[PDB]
Amino acid sequence: EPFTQKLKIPKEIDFEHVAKAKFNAQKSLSALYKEKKTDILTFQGDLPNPTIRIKNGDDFELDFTNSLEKPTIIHWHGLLVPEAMDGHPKDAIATQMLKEYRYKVNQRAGTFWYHTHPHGRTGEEIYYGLAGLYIIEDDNEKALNLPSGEFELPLIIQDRRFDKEGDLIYKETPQDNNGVLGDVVMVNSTVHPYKNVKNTKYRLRILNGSSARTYKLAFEGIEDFMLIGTDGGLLEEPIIVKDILIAVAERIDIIVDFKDKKVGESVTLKTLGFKEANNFVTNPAYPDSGAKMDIMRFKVTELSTQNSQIPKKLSTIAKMKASDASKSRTITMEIIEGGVWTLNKKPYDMHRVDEKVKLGSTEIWEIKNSAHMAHPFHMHGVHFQVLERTSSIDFPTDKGWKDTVLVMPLESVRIIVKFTIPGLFVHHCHILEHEDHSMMANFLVE
Ligand SMILES: [Cu+2]
Numbered sequence: 001e002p003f004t005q006k007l008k009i010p011k012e013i014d015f016e017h018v019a020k021a022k023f024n025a026q027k028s029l030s031a032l033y034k035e036k037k038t039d040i041l042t043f044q045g046d047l048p049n050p051t052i053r054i055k056n057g058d059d060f061e062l063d064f065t066n067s068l069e070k071p072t073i074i075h076w077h078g079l080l081v082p083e084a085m086d087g088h089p090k091d092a093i094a095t096q097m098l099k100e101y102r103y104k105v106n107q108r109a110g111t112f113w114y115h116t117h118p119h120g121r122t123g124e125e126i127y128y129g130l131a132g133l134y135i136i137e138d139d140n141e142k143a144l145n146l147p148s149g150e151f152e153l154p155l156i157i158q159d160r161r162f163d164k165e166g167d168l169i170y171k172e173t174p175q176d177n178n179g180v181l182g183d184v185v186m187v188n189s190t191v192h193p194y195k196n197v198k199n200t201k202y203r204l205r206i207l208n209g210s211s212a213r214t215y216k217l218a219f220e221g222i223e224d225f226m227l228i229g230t231d232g233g234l235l236e237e238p239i240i241v242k243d244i245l246i247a248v249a250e251r252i253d254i255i256v257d258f259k260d261k262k263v264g265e266s267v268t269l270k271t272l273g274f275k276e277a278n279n280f281v282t283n284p285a286y287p288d289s290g291a292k293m294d295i296m297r298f299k300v301t302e303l304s305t306q307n308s309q310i311p312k313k314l315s316t317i318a319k320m321k322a323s324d325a326s327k328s329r330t331i332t333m334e335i336i337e338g339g340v341w342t343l344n345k346k347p348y349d350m351h352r353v354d355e356k357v358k359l360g361s362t363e364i365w366e367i368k369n370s371a372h373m374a375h376p377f378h379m380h381g382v383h384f385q386v387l388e389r390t391s392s393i394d395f396p397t398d399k400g401w402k403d404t405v406l407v408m409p410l411e412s413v414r415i416i417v418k419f420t421i422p423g424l425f426v427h428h429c430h431i432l433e434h435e436d437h438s439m440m441a442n443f444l445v446e
Pocket residue numbers: 075077115249430
């Protein structure tokens with residue numbers, strides 16, 4: 001039943017209305033598909049999990065309780081917080097324990113998210129539900145007067161596999177240790193959804209929260225859309241694009257325009273495929289990285305007089321220079337034998353320091369990849385800029401602040417990063433199955 005069900009909109013935990021929130025990671029049931037209540041994991045009882053929303057400079061406070069069978073912890077993905085609140089895998093809290101998160105937001109507006117991060121089990125916990133979105137606001141962005149209220153939409157894209165009953169299926173074959181691809185696409189935990197829209201501008205806040213699938217998103221119905229932000233918030237100026245690549249854990253802030261749409265018409269969000277991301281052979285039962293897949297439909301149901309007008313200066317981004325760095329280092333992304341995914345040919349030791357870095361310095365990290373697969377590389381505790389790629393695929397998201405960057409097979413991506421927060425952090429591929437099977441490491445800011 002294509003585009004039968006209405007898109008679910010997450011409740012907001014807005015830190016202008018909430019001083020301290022409560023999350024409790026617990027077993028739940030929802031009918032994601034086939035009217036089958038399937039076992040899921042939630043933070044406050046249902047899916048989608050709530051969108052946190054906070055101004056820069058406000059105090060974030062959240063009491064997290066773990067009612068789950070095994071230890072876990074929440075990582076606030078893209079946030080610049082003290083290591084003790086970052087949700088390092090070594091800080092997982094046991095069943096029936098409490099962690100009190102407290103930090104002062106101190107970073108520019110942008111589109112972030114949050115998920116649990118237990119060592120070896122992150123792919124599973126996110127697959128069964130423990131993720132949501134986090135939005136930081138600031139005065140710059142507010143003064144832009146971008147489409148807001150009913151015209152800003154969170155979109156969490158996750159591909160899934162369901163059985164005949166309607167229950168969820170995670171890993172099935174050995175090839176799935178290389179990444180779980182799915183044949184059903186959910187947005188905001190809704191299978192094949194539809195959104196009733198007006199024929200004006202909509203700001204879409206897009207997170208790829210899948211296990212593995214890299215999406216090449218296009219809208220069949222409109223001619224253009226506008227890239228205005230990445231992981232780290234607004235670009236300097238909009239970029240007109242016809243399609244857009246987004247890997248796991250990456251975030252995009254686009255503007256779409258329905259002004260030429262007649263009532264009764266539709267625009268369909270879909271992925272055009274990206275066969276180049278994967279040179280292994282995926283589980284045959286499920287479509288591969290090149291698959292064309294419909295994702296959701298926006299139904300144009302009402303005419304609108306809204307004239308908002310997207311500014312041409314969005315923000316300023318000081319473009320860091322290669323000479324500003326005082327050290328270069330190389331991270332190799334390979335598969336070593338036994339099918340263990342690694343960085344620098346080492347499996348993750350939770351207790352070992354793989355890179356030691358001076359607090360307040362600027363470094364060039366060169367990320368070199370092997371032939372087998374594209375990898376989304378993420379670092380905690382930092383935002384970085386993309387100095388350069390060697391492959392030729394056009395990545396307009398390079399033009400913005402980033403925390404996760406897609407590294408193509410045999411590509412070298414060379415990023416530049418200033419370390420502002422001390423402590424032990426992790427860097428890793430964010431393909432969840434690879435991270436779970438050891439593609440992870442620690443760096444120490446000192
Ligand atoms: Cu993450």
